[PDB]
Design a protein around this nucleic acid. Structure first.
Lengths: 205, 82, 80, 85
RNA sequence: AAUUGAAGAGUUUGAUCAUGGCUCAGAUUGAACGCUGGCGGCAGGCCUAACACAUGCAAGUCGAACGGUAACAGGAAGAAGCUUGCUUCUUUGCUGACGAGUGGCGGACGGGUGAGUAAUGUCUGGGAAACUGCCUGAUGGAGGGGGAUAACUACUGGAAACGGUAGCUAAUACCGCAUAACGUCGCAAGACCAAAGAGGGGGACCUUCGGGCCUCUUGCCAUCGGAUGUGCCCAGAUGGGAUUAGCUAGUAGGUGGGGUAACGGCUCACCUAGGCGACGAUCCCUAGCUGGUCUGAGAGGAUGACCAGCCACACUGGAACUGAGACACGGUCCAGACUCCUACGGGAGGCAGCAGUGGGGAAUAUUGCACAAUGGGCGCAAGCCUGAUGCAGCCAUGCCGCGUGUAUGAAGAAGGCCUUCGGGUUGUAAAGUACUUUCAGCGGGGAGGAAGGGAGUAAAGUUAAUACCUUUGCUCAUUGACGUUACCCGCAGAAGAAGCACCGGCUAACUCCGUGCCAGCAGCCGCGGUAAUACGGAGGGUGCAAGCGUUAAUCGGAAUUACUGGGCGUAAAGCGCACGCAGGCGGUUUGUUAAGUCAGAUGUGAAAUCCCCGGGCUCAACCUGGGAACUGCAUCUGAUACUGGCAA
């Protein structure tokens, strides 16, 4: 029900940093990125069309830490909502509670944020939410409880929040350790390199 | 006999009762002439918990319909407004 | 008013009764073609004024025999 | 079978007997009427009709003949005597 | 706001293009099987043998209808050990109550199953010739008598089941008599038709001093309405077969008699000789139908498990009786097959109610708890009953959610596998280090489903009455099966928690070793006869994940039945050619109609489900509010271009 394995291997099959070990240090430096996703990893794949579509879906799931039935349900919900299904799908992945806890700098990675969410260290709107996939509405206040406030992790995580780009659709404020999800993220406000038409076309075959 | 009575429709350990007008010898969740309101015994402490069409109820009691103890209790709860 | 139908007499020879074919003109559900379609009805008439080949209006009443739940109102267009 | 179905069995037998007797007397009076119409007798059949009328209305009221049937009888028989008289 | 909706590929050939079949990639399921398996929420769970059933429950209730006392607990009276003050025993239905019985009501509901039924069914829309317990409104009546019969007692038959005979008693049981309509018959005149009391309380009066009498509540009867439910009719629609073309004598219609609640060949007598049928009758095979479900871009195709509406069935075949309602699942009668008891004379039974067995099968669950809620029956109510229902148990059967940690960590450790022996890879993976405690485990706290019901008051109404009863407030104890509940807090420690398939192409993911046309694999193409990316193992990777594969089944892809949306010179496909009936289509102008067509309105298209916008469960699944939708049918109002009818 979640991955639990070598993370930088997943980041190495995709060829791109999936932010799976954000943590203390800088850019990887001990990953052997691009070089060998397994034993025959030095081989160029010469990847197919199914391979590029598949590999795009796997990039997105392995970023946000979602498995397939849950992702597939996000595609059905993004499909039925009015508008653009790629952009709706990223809006559904960005409203996840573990993601919003990661974006605010409360967790160093999304797995650490998922353990903060999971171990009842996070309230939304003054109610404790235990669930990684809670869908944070706009104009909500998500914060850390009094237990697990001033624990080392979150402090260190806010320390590495300043190294990243400070997302526009949040009120990050780390003094009180509370945040406000203000609006839904625009497609132009996130990541610029994921090709969601490939995963629309992957599920539409 | 036609009866204005409750009919259990929510999930397990979470009932939602719909007050209907049925021929009394039907099943509880079976055939009804018309539904006329509802009663959620939880709902939350928000706004309603219960709405209930008093004009149609007065119509059926004018016709000769009987009323169970809960529906009488709900009409005694929502008296005219509160 | 009353609901009535129009049709033509298809046969005659029965003892104060008649039988009338009705032509309903209905679209085919799959193919979208308007197709003629009959409905033969055993119709009552007191004193059997209408003969074969007529055109007669017809209304529904109580049962008068087996099938026979239809009775004429007006014989038109008898022309031989 | 072991219930209050035994009581309904014995009551329905008792009421079967009672109803069979009253139904049989009613039918014999009606046979008096249109068995007097079999011969061409006007006032004899009128006497029999006056003899059957209270019992057929009465068995209609008691609940074993369901009064429309009551009506039919007297209606049919009235027709017979004014077919005759 | 409520349709944002459509993918291909492999294989005919030396190669090609086309045709064309086969096959794969998706979604789904009441699933089964194999390997594996942590928790929870919500659902689902005999698809086969409508096979046979042990055992326990599944329909009772009312003494405020009645005679009554079998118990239980009191009361009165008597007698006794007598502690002259408490026990023991006895007569009394005197009382709260109540076994058995009569009687009223319910056992036609609820619950099960899908055998039969291809149209006496179902769906949609009309209709007329109807009945309707309980419930409601209105108008009135509710007077006066009689004979019985259970129970009971006494005999008595029978092994039992079950009876018989003779007496006794009651009623809201039964029967007359009176009374009689805006009721039935009748054109009228007229004729005729019913009933039942019980309970609470009481000032005065009368008491045969039991109670009359007054008042209230409730019940009875009659008629007309209403509501609900049911019966009947019509039209359209709802499988396959023409290698099934004729079927039908109560058959088709009429008149009259009978019958039903009601029309009707429903039935009978007579008369006519019809009726149905290629727009598919009749026969045969199959089948419960629908809202819906699955698939689909859609049109369609398949299906109709759960949930809900309708029908049918209740061991098998038939029949009626009682009743408002049945031709009756836990009723009666007969017959039959099976099983059982027997004293051999005869008797008894019916899980397709809920659990459960045996069998059958690839396959499907506990002989649980409670009536606390909702509903039902009875009752004035209290309450009693309820295997409906609420819940719990078992099962990864499905859907949904969460977990198996998190960060750091290069000596790129050891070991495995490969190696062009340089190294590469497993791999930040592990170990180390630093944190976190979800869920499981342990200990505390603790909502909500609980509204009612009971006991006292106070006021109002009624009344002769400050009683009784009804209604409304107030107060007082209370009413939870689930249930060591949901949820909250604290404890200890990463501590209890990852498999399954695949890796030649389709199709994401590669090498080594073993085997050598073998062993074996395979959905199709096809691999294997010595260096096999296809077999078996290992390392590595890929996909899914408490699941994963295989199998079965459906739709898709399949434009390979083409209505949307195909073809026919040579690929399959133009009758050998004509004439022509039924059928389909029909030049051109004007007028009328308005059937098709179009527009609007109204009634209906059950609720749930799908869709949209919201709301509640920490979220989700789930539940839910409002709308849209249900593409239809009927009626009315219009328009008249096109099609049809009619006239020229």
């Amino acid at each position: 029900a979640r991955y639990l394995g070598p993370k930088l291997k997943l980041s190495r099959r995709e060829g791109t940093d999936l932010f799976l070990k954000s943590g203390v240090r800088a850019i990887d430096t001990k990953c052997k990125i691009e070089q060998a996703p397994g034993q025959h990893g030095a081989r160029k794949p010469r990847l197919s069309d199914y391979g590029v579509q598949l590999r795009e879906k796997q990039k997105v799931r392995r970023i946000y830490g979602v498995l397939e039935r849950q992702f597939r349900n996000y595609y059905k919900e993004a499909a039925r909502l009015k508008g653009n299904t790629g952009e709706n799908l990223l809006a559904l992945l960005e409203g996840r509670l573990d993601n919003v806890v990661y974006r605010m700098g409360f967790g160093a990675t999304r797995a650490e944020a998922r353990q903060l969410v999971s171990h009842k260290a996070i309230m939304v709107n003054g109610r404790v939410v235990n669930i990684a996939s809670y869908q944070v509405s706009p104009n909500d206040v998500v914060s850390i409880r009094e237990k697990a406030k001033k624990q080392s992790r979150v402090k260190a995580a806010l320390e590495l929040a300043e190294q990243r780009e400070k997302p526009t659709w949040l009120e990050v404020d780390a003094g009180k350790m509370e945040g406000t999800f203000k609006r839904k993220p625009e497609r132009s406000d996130l990541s610029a390199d994921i090709n969601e038409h490939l995963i629309v076309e992957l599920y539409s075959k | 006999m036609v009866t204005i009575r409750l009919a259990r429709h929510g999930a397990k350990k979470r009932p939602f009762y719909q007050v209907v007008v049925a021929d009394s010898r039907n099943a509880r969740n079976g055939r009804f002439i018309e539904r006329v309101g509802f009663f959620n015994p939880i709902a939350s402490e928000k706004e309603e918990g219960t709405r209930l069409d008093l004009d149609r109820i007065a119509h059926w009691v004018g016709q000769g319909a009987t009323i169970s103890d809960r529906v009488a209790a709900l009409i005694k709860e929502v008296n005219k407004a509160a | 008013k009353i609901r009535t139908l129009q049709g033509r007499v298809v046969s005659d020879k029965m003892e104060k009764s008649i039988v009338v074919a009705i032509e309903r003109f209905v679209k085919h559900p799959i193919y979208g073609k308007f197709i003629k379609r009959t409905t033969k009805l055993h119709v009552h008439d007191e004193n059997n004024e209408c003969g074969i080949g007529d055109v007669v209006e017809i209304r529904e009443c109580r049962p008068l025999s087996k099938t026979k739940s239809w009775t004429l109102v007006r014989v038109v267009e008898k022309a031989v | 079978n072991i219930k209050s179905a035994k009581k309904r069995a014995i009551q329905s037998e008792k009421a079967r007997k009672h109803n069979a007797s009253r139904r049989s007397m009613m039918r014999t009076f009606i046979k008096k009427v249109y068995a007097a119409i079999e011969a061409g007798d006007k006032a004899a059949a009128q006497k029999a009709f006056n003899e059957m009328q209270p019992i057929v209305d009465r068995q209609a009221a008691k609940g074993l003949i369901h009064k429309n049937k009551a009506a039919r009888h007297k209606a049919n028989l009235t027709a017979q005597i004014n077919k005759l008289a």
